[PDB]
Amino acid sequence: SHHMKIKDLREKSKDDLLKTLTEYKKELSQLRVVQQTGGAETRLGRIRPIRKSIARILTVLNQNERSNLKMFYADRKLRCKTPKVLRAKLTHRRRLALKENEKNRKTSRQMRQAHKFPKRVYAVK
Amino acid sequence: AKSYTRPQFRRPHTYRKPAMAKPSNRVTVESKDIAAFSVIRYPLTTDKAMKKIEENNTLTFIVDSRANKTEIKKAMRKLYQVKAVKVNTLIRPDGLKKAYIRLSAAHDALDTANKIGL
Amino acid sequence: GRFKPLAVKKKYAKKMNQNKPVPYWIRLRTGNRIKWNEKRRHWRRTKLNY
Amino acid sequence: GAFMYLNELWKKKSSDVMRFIQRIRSWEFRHQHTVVRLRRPTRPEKARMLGYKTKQGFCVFRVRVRRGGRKRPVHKGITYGKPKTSGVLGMKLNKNNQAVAEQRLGKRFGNLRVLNSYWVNMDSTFKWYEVIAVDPMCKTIRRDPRINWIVNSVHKHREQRGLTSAGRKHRGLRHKGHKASKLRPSYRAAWRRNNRIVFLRKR
Amino acid sequence: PLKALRPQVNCPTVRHNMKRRLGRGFSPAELKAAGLNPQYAATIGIRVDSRRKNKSEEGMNVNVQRLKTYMSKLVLFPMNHKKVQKGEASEEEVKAATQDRSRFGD
RNA sequence: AAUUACCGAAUCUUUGAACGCAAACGGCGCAUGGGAGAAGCUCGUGUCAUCCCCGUGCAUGCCAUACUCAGUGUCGA
RNA sequence: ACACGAGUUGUUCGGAAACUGAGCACAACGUUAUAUCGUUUUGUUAGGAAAGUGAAGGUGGUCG
RNA sequence: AAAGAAGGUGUUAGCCCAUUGAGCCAUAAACCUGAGCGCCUCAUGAACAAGCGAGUAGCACUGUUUGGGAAUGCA
RNA sequence: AGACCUGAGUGUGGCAGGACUACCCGCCGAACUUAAGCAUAUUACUCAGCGGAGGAAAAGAAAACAACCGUGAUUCUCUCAGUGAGCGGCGAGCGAAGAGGGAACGAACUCGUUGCCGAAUCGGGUCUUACAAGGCCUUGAGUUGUGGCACAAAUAUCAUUU
Numbered sequence: 019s020h021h022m023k024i025k026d027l028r029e030k031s032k033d034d035l036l037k038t039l040t041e042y043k044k045e046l047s048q049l050r051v052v053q054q055t056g057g058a059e060t061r062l063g064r065i066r067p068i069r070k071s072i073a074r075i076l077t078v079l080n081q082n083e084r085s086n087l088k089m090f091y092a093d094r095k096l097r098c099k100t101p102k103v104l105r106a107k108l109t110h111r112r113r114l115a116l117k118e119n120e121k122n123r124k125t126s127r128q129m130r131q132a133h134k135f136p137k138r139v140y141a142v143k
Numbered sequence: 144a145k146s147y148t149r150p151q152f153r154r155p156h157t158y159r160k161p162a163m164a165k166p167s168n169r170v171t172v173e174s175k176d177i178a179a180f181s182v183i184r185y186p187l188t189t190d191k192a193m194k195k196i197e198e199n200n201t202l203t204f205i206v207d208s209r210a211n212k213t214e215i216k217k218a219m220r221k222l223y224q225v226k227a228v229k230v231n232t233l234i235r236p237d238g239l240k241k242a243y244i245r246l247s248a249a250h251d252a253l254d255t256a257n258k259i260g261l
Numbered sequence: 262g263r264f265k266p267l268a269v270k271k272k273y274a275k276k277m278n279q280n281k282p283v284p285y286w287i288r289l290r291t292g293n294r295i296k297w298n299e300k301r302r303h304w305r306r307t308k309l310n311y
Numbered sequence: 312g313a314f315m316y317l318n319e320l321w322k323k324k325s326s327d328v329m330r331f332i333q334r335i336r337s338w339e340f341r342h343q344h345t346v347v348r349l350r351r352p353t354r355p356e357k358a359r360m361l362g363y364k365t366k367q368g369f370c371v372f373r374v375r376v377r378r379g380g381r382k383r384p385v386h387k388g389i390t391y392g393k394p395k396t397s398g399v400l401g402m403k404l405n406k407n408n409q410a411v412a413e414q415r416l417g418k419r420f421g422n423l424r425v426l427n428s429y430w431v432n433m434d435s436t437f438k439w440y441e442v443i444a445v446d447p448m449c450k451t452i453r454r455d456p457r458i459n460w461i462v463n464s465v466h467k468h469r470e471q472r473g474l475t476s477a478g479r480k481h482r483g484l485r486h487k488g489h490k491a492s493k494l495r496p497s498y499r500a501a502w503r504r505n506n507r508i509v510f511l512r513k514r
Numbered sequence: 515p516l517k518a519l520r521p522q523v524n525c526p527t528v529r530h531n532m533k534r535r536l537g538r539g540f541s542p543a544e545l546k547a548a549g550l551n552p553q554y555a556a557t558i559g560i561r562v563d564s565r566r567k568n569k570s571e572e573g574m575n576v577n578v579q580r581l582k583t584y585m586s587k588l589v590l591f592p593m594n595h596k597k598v599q600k601g602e603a604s605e606e607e608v609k610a611a612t613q614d615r616s617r618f619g620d
Numbered sequence: 621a622a623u624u625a626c627c628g629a630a631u632c633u634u635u636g637a638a639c640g641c642a643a644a645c646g647g648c649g650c651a652u653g654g655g656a657g658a659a660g661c662u663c664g665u666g667u668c669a670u671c672c673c674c675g676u677g678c679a680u681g682c683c684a685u686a687c688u689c690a691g692u693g694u695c696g697a
Numbered sequence: 698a699c700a701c702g703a704g705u706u707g708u709u710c711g712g713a714a715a716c717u718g719a720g721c722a723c724a725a726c727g728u729u730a731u732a733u734c735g736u737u738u739u740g741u742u743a744g745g746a747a748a749g750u751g752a753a754g755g756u757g758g759u760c761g
Numbered sequence: 762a763a764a765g766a767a768g769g770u771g772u773u774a775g776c777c778c779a780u781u782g783a784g785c786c787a788u789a790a791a792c793c794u795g796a797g798c799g800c801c802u803c804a805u806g807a808a809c810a811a812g813c814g815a816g817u818a819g820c821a822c823u824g825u826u827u828g829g830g831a832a833u834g835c836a
Numbered sequence: 837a838g839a840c841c842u843g844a845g846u847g848u849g850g851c852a853g854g855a856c857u858a859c860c861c862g863c864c865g866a867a868c869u870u871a872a873g874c875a876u877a878u879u880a881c882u883c884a885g886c887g888g889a890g891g892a893a894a895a896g897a898a899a900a901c902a903a904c905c906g907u908g909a910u911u912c913u914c915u916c917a918g919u920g921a922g923c924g925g926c927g928a929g930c931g932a933a934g935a936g937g938g939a940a941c942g943a944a945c946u947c948g949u950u951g952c953c954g955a956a957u958c959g960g961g962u963c964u965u966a967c968a969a970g971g972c973c974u975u976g977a978g979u980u981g982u983g984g985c986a987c988a989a990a991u992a993u994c995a996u997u998u
């Protein structure tokens with residue numbers, strides 16, 4: 019029956035997606051009254067296709083909010099006020115670890131000795 | 144500073160700056176229109192419930208257990224175009240919260256309960 | 262008595278909703294194992310003590 | 312050089328001038344807290360020897376420990392069993408107080424990786440040690456090649472495991488030859504090695 | 515080679531005087547007697563030992579001859595295989611070249 | 621628009637190191653923002669007093685930092 | 698007992714919001730190899746700058 | 762049969778089924794390849810008389826630890 | 837007035853806290869047992885207790901072994917060696933190291949000091965597709981010293997354009 023496919027659901031705006039969310043929370047709420055007052059097994063039984071299509075509208079609304087907010091903090095030099103829900107979640111230990119732009123830092127002498135005496139490729143016969 | 148008239152040195156009040164308001168910490172939509180479908184769940188249809196619709200004026204619903212009586216009245220206005228004058232909530236031994244909702248005597252209880260359908 | 266915390270009332274409410282038998286159509290599935298409920302608590306035999 | 316005058320002045324610790332300065336210092340240190348942060352180290356010649364630089368993420372704390380031996384904490388001095396284990400007062404801890412001072416800093420200020428400390432001053436009751444710590448999240452410390460090793464998470468509490476200089480003292484790792492054969496790399500690393508009943512396969 | 519070149523050193527303790535084995539590295543006097551920079555020799559496959567003292571000329575000349583043999587077998591590929599910089603391979607040598615798994619470098 | 625397996629995008633109640641304060645309390649704050657609002661006021665709309673919801677900031681210690689201070693500490697006009 | 702279906706309605710009732718008591722022990726401070734230890738109401742924390750409240754007045758839109 | 766492989770199927774399966782090979786297809790980074798390969802930018806290899814770790818080491822007493830004994834290590 | 841020093845208060849950006857804990861590092865630390873009793877000794881520098889990491893940890897680059905024709909960081913293995921070592925009511929019992937055959941191994945480097953330089957440094961801004969080992973700017977730290985060059989594998993300093 020009524021079943022929001024997501025391909026025709028990602029082309030909606032933020033206002034029409036909310037207007038069809040109130041449409042489908044309302045249709046679920048007036049099937050919770052037929053689930054308590056008897057209920058034919060055909061009218062009841064549209065409880066999964068509504069409740070999983072509410073889950074499709076909310077995952078289009080939420081994936082369009084993180085997309086339009088990740089492209090609000092990586093745009094410029096505002097990346098110190100980026101909220102931590104939008105940052106790259108790794109292991110806790112991997113965020114504190116030395117990045118590889120760091121950790122290969124070396125002395126002016128340590129650069130010289132790898133330039134004055136570099137490791138040669140060679141063979142033997 | 145100067146003019147120390149008390150026997151002990153209490154802390155002088157420096158200038159103290161307010162804290163910045165952060166932009167956001169939640170990335171999730173929350174529709175204010177669907178927000179009262181979680182307050183009101185479904186009506187009861189028991190024998191004590193059917194008697195109170197006819198004889199007193201009241202309607203009976205399972206509501207969510209973490210709502211107060213004020214926000215149940217406001218959900219019985221936006222969902223159902225009726226006026227609640229009195230809500231008497233009750234957390235059941237089942238674990239659910241049941242509300243008895245008396246209408247304003249400008250609104251018929253059966254005319255609302257046919258539109259809901261029960 | 263009358264005094265209970267609501268967190269004790271909501272634990273006592275879960276055990277009332279668990280004290281229901283196995284339905285009959287469970288006994289008709291393919292790889293069935295369950296005849297009876299093995300956890301039917303009675304208020305006199307065994308005490309929860311919440 | 313300027314170090315050589317500072318270093319040889321701190322070898323004259325018993326002379327009348329350095330006994331005056333340590334007199335004043337030991338007065339004003341026992342009217343401070345157990346753990347005190349300084350802007351600059353009290354001995355800059357000995358702090359930089361030991362690893363401190365006047366960089367951004369380095370920081371020095373002066374830590375106080377009490378002197379004397381270890382009273383065994385048995386109840387009422389009553390202990391049981393064999394008479395060799397009966398002593399309460401003459402027993403002595405197997406960690407020096409410099410290590411104990413470094414562990415009291417780093418168990419208290421958890422976000423800081425302490426490297427080693429040094430002796431500052433004695434009293435009849437207390438000893439003081441400036442413990443050099445370093446902030447591993449400071450951008451100066453992460454980008455600097457000769458100190459960025461401290462940011463790696465194997466150095467998290469070097470003090471609690473005996474990896475500082477004062478830790479390596481009470482482990483016996485000042486010695487290498489026949490004077491340390493029972494204790495290289497560890498006493499437990501040699502106990503396990505010398506006592507595990509090896510079962511060769513074909514035997 | 516899978517294993518770098520190691521010197522021939524004697525064995526200590528008069529039980530083992532008449533024996534020889536492979537040392538840690540060539541001293542920086544056997545290397546200079548072979549006309550070879552010790553910092554440069556570590557890149558072209560030679561182990562170097564700054565600690566060993568060379569207390570006789572027979573034990574020094576054995577390991578110089580190991581270095582003189584090794585450099586004549588050495589091929590030493592170019593950095594840039596178009597612009598050859600020094601005495602290096604000539605790509606008829608940088609294509610016929612092989613390695614050993616001879617378990618000692620011998 | 622099957623179903624299953626896998627995984628990158630998300631959701632993830634109340635708690636718990638648990639950290640606004642508490643706690644056999646589904647309890648109570650101080651700033652701040654949003655909401656709903658049948659009394660009022662407005663020329664039924666707006667606006668909306670308390671009341672009532674919802675988000676965020678706020679444990680403590682420390683490191684770095686950019687402003688307000690204390691000191692018969694040493695100076696200095 | 699067993700199965701099924703119900704049943705606990707609050708401005709004022711009891712509690713909390715919101716009291717103090719015997720006491721407890723968070724912060725602070727000290728101790729301890731170790732905090733999982735001590736002190737913490739005899740008016741009362743802490744070598745101990747823990748009051749963020751504001752009388753009166755000055756500054757300039759409102760009511761006699 | 763380059764496949765005999767050992768699981769399933771109503772009763773003992775190489776032939777009933779799945780398997781058991783050569784290889785095909787698709788890949789966020791990372792990994793590996795004349796330190797893969799260009800461009801920009803940026804570094805820079807080779808040519809042309811002084812001293813070196815001080816409440817430290819040691820020593821004494823005590824305590825412990827060790828095969829370490831006129832004292833192995835430590836406090 | 838102002839400064840410097842030593843301390844506060846807030847703002848901003850961060851971090852520590854608990855879990856696991858087989859192995860590993862630091863401490864703490866027994867007794868039953870054995871000695872045909874038992875107290876030294878043994879069990880055992882083990883169990884239990886407390887703290888702390890990692891994918892391993894710890895060790896590691898000679899204030900080493902040797903006494904040789906010498907060896908050459910650490911770790912591990914077989915052996916040394918249940919020892920004509922040693923310790924021990926010299927009782928019960930305990931207990932190694934060097935050498936040699938191997939595993940691994942591109943294995944080495946960084947400060948401090950000294951000498952020569954002296955902010956050439958670091959952080960924040962900002963501009964280059966860029967939180968550049970880039971420019972340019974900053975009293976913000978810093979001269980109570982950040983950085984560079986040389987120090988046994990050494991043959992030394994600055995230029996510069998090839």
Ligand SMILES: NC[C@@H]1O[C@H](O[C@H]2[C@@H](O)[C@H](O[C@@H]3[C@@H](O)[C@H](N)C[C@H](N)[C@H]3O[C@H]3O[C@H](CO)[C@@H](O)[C@H](O)[C@H]3N)O[C@@H]2CO)[C@H](N)[C@@H](O)[C@@H]1O
Pocket residue numbers: 514
């Ligand atoms: N026959 C009795 C059994 O012997 C078994 O062990 C027997 C053998 O397995 C064991 O042999 C051991 C060998 O396993 C171990 N890996 C090394 C040892 N060299 C051998 O021992 C051998 O040499 C010794 C003298 O050196 C002889 O006394 C002994 O008889 C001989 N088997 O010695 C025992 C003599 O037969 C078990 N210990 C046990 O099941 C049981 O006591």
Ligand SMILES: [Mg+2]
Pocket residue numbers: none
């Ligand atoms: Mg050994």
Ligand SMILES: [Mg+2]
Pocket residue numbers: none
């Ligand atoms: Mg809480």
Ligand SMILES: [Mg+2]
Pocket residue numbers: none
């Ligand atoms: Mg019953």
Ligand SMILES: [Mg+2]
Pocket residue numbers: 816
């Ligand atoms: Mg001494």
Ligand SMILES: [Mg+2]
Pocket residue numbers: none
């Ligand atoms: Mg922990």
Ligand SMILES: [Mg+2]
Pocket residue numbers: 869
């Ligand atoms: Mg036993």
Ligand SMILES: [Mg+2]
Pocket residue numbers: 872
């Ligand atoms: Mg017996």
Ligand SMILES: [Mg+2]
Pocket residue numbers: none
């Ligand atoms: Mg244990």
Ligand SMILES: [Mg+2]
Pocket residue numbers: none
């Ligand atoms: Mg390591």
Ligand SMILES: [Mg+2]
Pocket residue numbers: none
């Ligand atoms: Mg320097």
